[PDB]
């Protein structure tokens, strides 16, 4: 019985920490979701310069390349 009271009280502070933790995590995921939208643009441009480098390399190798 007294042990149970102690356990219930510790469980109460536990549950409060649980809810606070998860609320912060909700904010975390929400933040990342909003961020995500501001990343696809950059990703596209990254792949654009990537394939640019790839294709220009292939063509330079085709012509008189001037590498090492």
């Amino acid at each position: 019985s007294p042990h149970e009271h102690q356990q219930n009280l510790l469980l109460s502070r536990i549950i409060t920490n649980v809810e606070k933790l998860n609320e912060a995590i909700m904010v975390m995921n929400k933040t990342l979701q909003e961020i995500n939208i501001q990343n696809m643009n950059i990703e596209l441009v990254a792949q654009m310069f990537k394939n640019y480098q790839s294709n220009v390399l292939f063509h330079l190798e085709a012509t008189d390349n001037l590498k090492d």
């Binding site: 394939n51 790839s54 294709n55 292939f58 063509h59 190798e61 085709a62 012509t63």
Partner: protein, 66 residues
Amino acid sequence: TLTEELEKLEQQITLTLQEIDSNFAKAHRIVTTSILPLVEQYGEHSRAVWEATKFWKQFFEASANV
């Protein structure tokens, strides 16, 4: 690799097309360069030769015409 070779060979194709155009235009320039005046000179000298033959042909015509 796949799209790499695709774009690579595509560029090769375009380059080769431009090269074909270059060779083609080179032949065009050769003909348009001086071939036409050359044959004009040829025909001019040939015309002079016809003036040369213009004399002796008369005698052959005379032989046919007694």
